[PDB]
């Protein structure tokens, strides 16, 4: 059973993890040499490089799953790596599903697991965990406003101008364009007002709404992170009870 | 009598409220989803279900008054809602005027109080409702500066550019475009600087005013919230 001991030692090794991280970085840096248009002599180079990296990472994932069978299916990272290697093999056998092997360039994300011990990273990740509920409320509320306004926009402007409003599945896209303040007058409403001369009753209040919500979002953060820190000296007023 | 107590027991069933909410999600969902190549055979059935759901909805809104006689009227909620009930039932036997039937979606605002039911959503809705009036004062204040700048704009750029400064009912719109920082340079100002070479003196201080409305707005919110 000493080979299981060998796998437990040599697989669980800092040199092994460091080697596999430098190999993933070399995957990325070889993958990012592509330029178009191509002489096609590079193309048979690039396919072979994809093949070699895919096979080496398959040998990697097999050796990583050999050491335990049920301790797997536990972290999302290993399942995610299994999905990546699986999609790459599906591209490797079957014909042109090109552009579905392009998910593979996310494994550089694994570099984050190297830098847990950095003291500077801890402040920004504690910042990023301290924002989440406000954003996750704002997303649902703004989604409800979109679902209210989009159906009304489809019924109003639907017969004429179909390219921008002819279904729900594009009315969403046009209202997401108009929210972030790009070309909403010169490329949207100025052709609308030539045909429907009362279109400015619809788009002008809408802008107010989303703009209002966004400013509140920012200042909500600016009071909330301000609100807890004062509490961190309020207990010292308890320390000032004796004084 | 006792049947009054019975109808109070029936109308407080929240399963009926969830049913009518999902039902009217579906009711709004119908005529939206239609492909504009219109087959007009199931569109007839869409009009039928339109009639049916408005009828069931009217049965609800008149069945409401048997429980609450006056206390239903006191609520500011279910008032604009009742008004849009009436404006929805206008459509059934009247002439073809649109722009009134299409308001039938708005009562998805009913689930706003479902938003009130969530304890996590308690914070931000109260944060909005407590802060509306200090924003309303600022809205009136900058409406006055739009009205003072539009009249000044029309008399300088009315001749020779009638298409987007020719009258007040369009000068207001063009200057609202210029406030929100969209395409003011390549679309508005530089085609004017080939005729009146001192035009920027009127437009660059304008952005120094209505864009630095945004700074005291934050002060009003931060003092309030």
């Amino acid at each position: 059973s000493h080979m299981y001991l060998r796998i437990t030692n040599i697989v669980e090794s800092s040199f092994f993890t460091k080697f596999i991280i430098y190999l993933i970085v070399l995957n990325t840096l070889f993958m990012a040499m592509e330029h178009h248009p191509m002489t096609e002599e590079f193309k048979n180079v690039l396919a072979i490089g994809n093949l070699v990296f895919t096979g080496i990472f398959a040998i990697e994932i097999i050796l990583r799953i050999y050491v335990h069978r049920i301790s797997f299916f536990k972290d999302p990272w290993s399942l995610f790596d299994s999905l990546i290697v699986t999609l790459s093999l599906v591209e490797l056998f079957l014909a042109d599903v090109e552009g579905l092997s392009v998910l593979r360039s996310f494994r550089l994300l694994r570099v984050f697991r190297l830098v847990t011990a950095v003291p500077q990273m801890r402040k920004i990740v504690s910042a990023l965990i301290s924002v989440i509920p406000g954003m996750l409320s704002v997303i649902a509320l703004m989604t409800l406003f979109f679902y209210i306004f989009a159906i009304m926009a489809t019924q109003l402007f639907g017969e004429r101008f179909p390219e921008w409003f002819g279904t729900l599945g594009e009315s969403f896209y046009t209202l997401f364009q108009v929210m972030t303040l790009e070309s909403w007058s010169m490329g949207i409403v100025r052709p609308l007002m030539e045909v429907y001369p009362y279109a400015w009753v619809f788009f002008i209040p809408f802008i107010f709404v989303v703009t209002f919500v966004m400013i509140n979002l920012v200042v909500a953060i600016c009071v909330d992170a301000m609100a807890i820190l004062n509490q961190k000296e309020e207990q010292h007023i308890i320390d000032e009870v004796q004084s | 009598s006792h049947m009054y107590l019975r109808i109070t027991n029936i109308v407080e069933s929240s399963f009926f409220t969830k049913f009518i909410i999902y039902l009217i999600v579906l009711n709004t969902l119908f005529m939206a989803m239609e492909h504009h190549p219109m087959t007009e055979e199931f569109k007839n059935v869409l009009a039928i279900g339109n009639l049916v759901f408005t009828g069931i909805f009217a049965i609800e809104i008149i069945l409401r008054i048997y429980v609450h006689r006056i206390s239903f009227f006191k609520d500011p909620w279910s008032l604009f809602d009742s008004l849009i009930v009436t404006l929805s039932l206008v459509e059934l036997f009247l002439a073809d005027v649109e722009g009134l039937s299409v308001l039938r979606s708005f009562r998805l605002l009913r689930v706003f109080r479902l938003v009130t039911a969530v304890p996590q959503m308690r914070k931000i809705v109260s944060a909005l409702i407590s802060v509306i009036p200090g924003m309303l004062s600022v809205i009136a204040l900058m409406t006055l500066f739009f009205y003072i700048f539009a009249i000044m704009a029309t008399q300088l750029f009315g001749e020779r550019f009638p298409e987007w400064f020719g009258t007040l009912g369009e000068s207001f719109y063009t200057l609202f475009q210029v406030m929100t920082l969209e395409s003011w340079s390549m679309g508005i100002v530089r085609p004017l600087m080939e005729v009146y070479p001192y035009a920027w003196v009127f437009f660059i201080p304008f952005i120094f005013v209505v864009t630095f409305v945004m700074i005291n707005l934050v002060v009003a919110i931060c003092v309030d919230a």
Partner: antibody, heavy 122, light 109 residues
Framework: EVQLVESGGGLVKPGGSLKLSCAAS????????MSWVRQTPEKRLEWVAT????????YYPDSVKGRFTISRDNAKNSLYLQMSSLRSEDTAMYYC???????????????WGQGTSVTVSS | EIVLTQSPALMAASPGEKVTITCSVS???????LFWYQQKSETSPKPWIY???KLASGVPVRFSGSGSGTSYSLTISSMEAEDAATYYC?????????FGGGTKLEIKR
Amino acid sequence: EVQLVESGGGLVKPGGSLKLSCAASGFTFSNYAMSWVRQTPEKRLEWVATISNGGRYTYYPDSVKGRFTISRDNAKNSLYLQMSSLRSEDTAMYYCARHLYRYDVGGALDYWGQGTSVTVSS
Amino acid sequence: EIVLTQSPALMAASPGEKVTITCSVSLSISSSNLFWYQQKSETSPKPWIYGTSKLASGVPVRFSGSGSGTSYSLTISSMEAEDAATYYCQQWSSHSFTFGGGTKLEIKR
């Protein structure tokens, strides 16, 4: 210059096909809709087809449904009308036409072509 | 569907005359979408009146049209030397165009 050229044309036996091509010249072609309108030799018009700016939305009348096909290509500024399985009552003069307001279907028709004749006889 | 009705079939006139031609339809239709067209001999027809109140570009200022509801009309103030043509009234609908039947002028002599 703003012009329209309308190629093809001629005589086809009843049951054949023909593919017509309109090429526009001068305006920004990727910002209008376009439409085909025919005329009988008895001096009467009859709408045939239209298409939006992009190429994803088409429209047809009842009487030719599922038989005529319209297509665009912006990168060569060209308009294709592909036909099949003609009838006797289609011996007509065809016209390529531009709509009036930008980005719009279903308005006026401000600028036409010059007609191409298609005849069905055995 | 939305179908038209023209009147008269034919009409002939002497120059220097204020004549009137009509167009009608089987349903009430708004006045912002209704157009006119003019056709000479061997000419692809040209846009002539937009929106039943306005002339097109290059049109002489002697023509006008008016009406509403299900009744629309054109008025010629003084008939000229080149105004023997055939006229059309156009209407837009649910998703399908619709043309009239043509009305033709002649010079009496």
